[PDB]
Ligand binder design. Structure first.
Ligand SMILES: *C(=O)C[C@H](O)CCCCCCC
Length: 9
């Protein structure tokens, strides 16, 4: 999901 929407996971 986009790396947790931007969390980078
Ligand atoms: C989107 O961000 C793809 C990621 O690789 C997987 C996210 C998994 C969410 C489950 C952990 C809360």
């Amino acid at each position: 999901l986009x790396x947790x929407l931007x969390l980078x996971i």
